[PDB]
Symmetry: C3
Subunit: 509 residues, 3 copies
């Protein structure tokens, strides 16, 4: 084989790629490394959320649970919940046929509560010479009973005196008060229970006042012909509520002191509750990631990645070290091994390949590569850590008569999602183009530094390599790599070689 000048080549050092990304301008570009921006893994279970357990309502509806249906678990010792899990077809709802007023609003505020305590508002004896109505519809502990939170006031010895009770909110926190009205199926039943004709209930704070008369007639709830209407008010501290009645009142007994509420979600039963903890709960499973996007499920709650309508987004970190880079004047070598291995983030090195009479081949340039690792790390950390906003679902709880606002809320959630989706896709494509170009610019700069050191002592082959015009042993090569090579040392030799080469003829002259 013909004799050739010693050579040094500046460019990429890595293994085979096996990892593609897309850029704005090209698909399936092999790169030495990338990271995934989109989380696709989840627990497939309901978990505790940042250390706070949800409440699974089991076989009860929210209304049944909050009003104290005795078929439902008592909330006497509950202190908090991060969210609720409910069976849309729970058999235990209101045990006596009736309805809860403004119940969508109620569901929204109780979707999560960070601090919750049940409290006795008014003791039963306060109402005076009255008896407590119980019913087989609301059995508890083997006997006819009633909702835990309410007292059904009925006559004693065929008399119903005007009953009065009041509660002052001195808790320093908000207090949910529940009360109700029983509406008899017949005037006969109204007279029997309440004695007084046209009985009334008056409920007032300092800010509002409501009066309630009986609405008599037959209803179609299971097991009873009469009906109950349940009402509620959230008292701010300092508020005062009064109750007066001559028949029909379902008196408040227990209520709820709350702080930091409306913080959760009502998820649907089916997916199973597990002993696990995550920072983001979705209807599909819990998510524990530091990624800032997820494509798993739009219905999400907590410290969440933003839901996007997308597949995986691979963000380029490493090199575009492919066979065709020589077409753009660049050099790259593929190796399976290098002393110390490849650096983690970029996989791995800017560096040199040399060839002289003592052999080949490669060595990394640590300084430039470290500069590059610093740049890519800074870019990644900016793209990720600046997403420090609130990215869970834009969402509320609504009842069945609240279709329009429910649709609007869901549409806004979807539109915000469309914005983040497009932006994330385009950002990844654009930045991949930029990252790969930046690596190129970096090795080109290194190449120009070497060019500048060698000056007239080398021929620029235009492919990332220099043919050195003098013998350059491993020690000389090392002076080139560590930036101590002085071209003056080899000027004479190099000029002679240059002259020699100028005279050579492929076809003899």
């Amino acid at each position: 084989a013909d004799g050739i000048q010693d050579k040094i080549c500046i460019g990429y050092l890595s293994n085979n790629s096996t990892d593609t990304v897309d850029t704005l301008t090209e698909n399936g570009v092999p790169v030495t490394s990338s990271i995934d921006l989109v989380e696709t893994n989840h627990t497939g279970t309901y978990c505790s959320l940042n250390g706070v357990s949800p409440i699974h309502l089991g076989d009860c509806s929210f209304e049944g649970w909050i009003v104290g249906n005795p078929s439902c678990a008592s909330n006497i010792n509950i202190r908090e919940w991060s969210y609720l899990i409910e069976d849309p077809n729970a058999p235990h709802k209101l045990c006596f046929p009736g309805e809860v007023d403004n119940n969508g609003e109620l569901r929204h505020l109780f979707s999560g509560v960070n601090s919750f305590s049940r409290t006795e508002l008014i003791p039963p004896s306060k109402w005076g010479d009255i008896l407590e109505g119980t019913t087989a519809s609301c059995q508890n502990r083997g006997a006819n009973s009633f909702y835990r939170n309410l007292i059904w006031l009925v006559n004693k010895l065929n008399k119903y005196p005007v009953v009065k009770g009041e509660y002052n909110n001195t808790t320093g926190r908000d207090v949910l008060v529940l009360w109700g009205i029983h509406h008899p199926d017949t005037e006969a039943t109204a007279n029997k229970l309440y004695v007084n004709k046209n009985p009334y209930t008056l409920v007032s704070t300092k800010e509002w006042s409501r009066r309630y008369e009986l609405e008599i007639g037959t209803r179609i709830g299971d097991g009873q012909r009469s009906w109950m209407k349940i009402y509620w008010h959230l008292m701010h501290p300092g508020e005062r509520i009064t109750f007066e009645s001559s028949g029909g009142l379902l008196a408040p007994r227990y209520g709820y002191i709350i702080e930091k509420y409306g913080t959760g979600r009502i998820f649907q039963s089916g997916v199973r509750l597990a002993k696990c903890n995550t920072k983001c709960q979705t209807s599909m499973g819990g998510i524990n990631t530091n990624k800032t996007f997820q494509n798993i499920e739009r219905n999400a709650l907590g410290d969440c990645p933003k839901y996007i309508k997308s597949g995986q987004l691979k963000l380029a970190t490493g090199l575009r070290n492919v066979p065709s880079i020589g077409e753009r004047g660049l050099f790259g070598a593929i190796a399976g091994f290098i002393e110390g291995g490849w650096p983690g983030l970029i996989n791995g090195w800017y560096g040199f390949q040399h060839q002289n009479e003592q052999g080949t081949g490669i060595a990394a340039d640590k300084t430039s590569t470290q500069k590059a690792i610093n740049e890519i790390t800074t870019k990644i950390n900016n793209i990720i850590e600046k997403m420090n906003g609130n990215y869970d679902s834009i969402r509320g709880e609504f009842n069945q008569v609240e279709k329009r606002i429910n649709m609007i809320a869901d549409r806004v959630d979807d539109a915000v999602t469309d914005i983040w989706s497009y932006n994330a896709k385009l950002l990844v494509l654009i930045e991949n183009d930029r990252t790969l170009d930046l690596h190129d610019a970096n090795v080109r700069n290194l190449h120009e530094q070497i060019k500048r050191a060698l000056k007239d002592n080398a021929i620029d082959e235009g492919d990332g390599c220099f043919s050195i015009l003098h013998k350059c042993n491993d020690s000389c090569m090392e002076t080139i790599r560590n930036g101590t090579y002085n071209h003056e040392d080899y000027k004479e030799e190099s000029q002679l070689k240059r002259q020699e080469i100028e005279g050579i003829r492929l076809v003899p002259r």
Copy 2:
């Protein structure tokens, strides 16, 4: 004229550009081609929406149409609509003075419905020994009548027995049920129509119960001193609804079975309905386009481009091939004709211009240009195709009473629009700079490849051109354009010429 070396130039080949773009850093840059990102053309009419016709309500208001004002067209054979077109001053509203409860919600739910069927709920005979009220206010072509969907129950032989009727939703779908209450102007009229003292109506499902008494007094509607209140409920499959009255009930006769509703819009009359079809209806006209932005009208429905507050957005595809590029070391030639014509997307070529003793001299480099074409194609398709979310208006139907929520909804639509508008403008400016610089980079790389091929056989004149230091005929030039030129072949000749040129002096030494 003095003798000159043969020469080859590398750069842009195009015709004179006529259209301009803006970039983030420069105004009115002439380029060889661009595409428009914003649709400005529409039909100026109301059209079918993705194959589904709207309903023009003509001389009727929505309330008149839905309750069955006998002066409005019957919806007996209606099966679907994509949207509604309504005259705000339609003469045919509620024919008998009255009001529809929660009618903004009703309008929202019925703004579009993809499956619709009128259905008889309760047969009139079910109400028993009663008669049906008719009135000159709601005439059927000259005959006193009433709303098609309701029955005005009145006394028969001066008796009104308790009436009762019920409907079970067995349809497997949602059913809209309408009923009403007639409130007499006087006690005399109450007694005359309904006979019974203190007439009541009771309507209940298993979920809720409402009781209605008469509210007696003179109203100011046209043609009547009394008043009607109309109520509705949307029944889910399996619900059941019951009605009882001793006077006042406007009994349900027809209801509507509906599927996939709340999908439309109530547009205003004026713009004409035409035989045409479109992916996206606006209040100005229909849009058929593959562009992903429009600046025509914010009130838009369907498979729509995103509305933006912007003029046209021209996305550069072609070259910046202008006289001043020489200042940046770039070469360009302007020709009215080539051969095979110019490429459609970029209009048109990276290539060569040559000059030798045989003549001159233009030819395209197909590989590099096609690479650029694939690049631009990929960019455009990325920008456009990734906008695959939902971009019609964020909007609802609201009545006069719900101004606050109407305003908030409109503001959120406007904020989403502001985000898209700013992002679109900036994306186009930035990407235009990038595209133009990309073409430049591509022809520079071409130039460097030729420079590498020629080596010491040519002088780089820093303007995209190489002066060749040897005779280079058309065969030679073609070896240069096709990558087969071997510099060794001409070494002896080029070194002679170089000596020669090196010895020339403008002013004799």
Copy 3:
């Protein structure tokens, strides 16, 4: 001092850099200038908003002011307001214990109104043989009185004939009408005041009708045991409204003609109202800026910069002229002085440094620098002026029972904010990288132009400098700087010097 060639260097001329920015890939990069994109300065006061003063409600609540509590300032002379400032603990509310129906919505429509005129709807005389009730609860300068806007109709000589009154909106404008119902604590008081048994009030337009009976019982408002309910309706032009009562009506007297409403905000008292004018009012103070972002306060109103969750965002405008640019082959000179001083936007010049026998050595290149200034100016103006949307807070006024919708509105505001916050942070980082790189490319292009002019008459030292191979006095230097230098003029001399330099041996042959 060995002999050295004359030299010219092309690159940056500036003073020492006192200012740093961050880029997407690097923190704390010193640049010669930047601008702030985020406003952080404000007045700390409530100001006029675009020429329109707010109203400070002082000692009164909105409700007490709007219904005309005689303890509050009369609005008889008010013509407009941009926003309201209210004390949540304002002592003057409803002077006679009661409530305003739908007061969240009313607050929202009256948050700001651009044209306002109180108007007398119906004279007191119209209600007939009635008297006007007064109370010590609502005093006017010690005199028992009542709300300005209403008349408390009570018996005259123990008769209360049916009272009637009407108002036709013929103003071409929207008209707010207020009315109320007084609800006695006892039947005794009802009979005393109103005489008639079961008194009723009927209020109707052609669009709706409401009937009101008395709700008797004790309430807990200060200083009275009875209760008042206040209602309102905003009449559109052409509307008509009627009032009839046999007892209980608080009859409308004064209403409000309004145009362009719902435009303001109800801010909280505390921050002082000052004599100043701004185009954007926040709860913290007024903002007067051309910046398009603010990080002061999310509760903002008017022609506002967009609130973002961010620190300051510094946009690079100037040069990266640091000691280390030589590593990338770039030249830079630090000077405190230059004739003409440094240009404002970039601080300041692309230029030349020269060295010859006469001395040294700096001069600006005006053409290239002015080109750069035009580029940066154009970029900044695009980034700023394209942000011409509506960026004040997305919010509404809501009462205490409207928690869910309030929370949802606030969450949408927050999500829009999160979008702009991220986008602004990333835009600045990316564009800073691009700006610094653009300055570099500009000076490299100048460098290449000079290189092209010098041809073989200079050695490119790789550091932005050329060692000129012939003597090059100030005149010659100036021909290099103004582009008239002809390399042919110096060919002989240059070749001789090159040969000399070639033959020299730092280390002897």
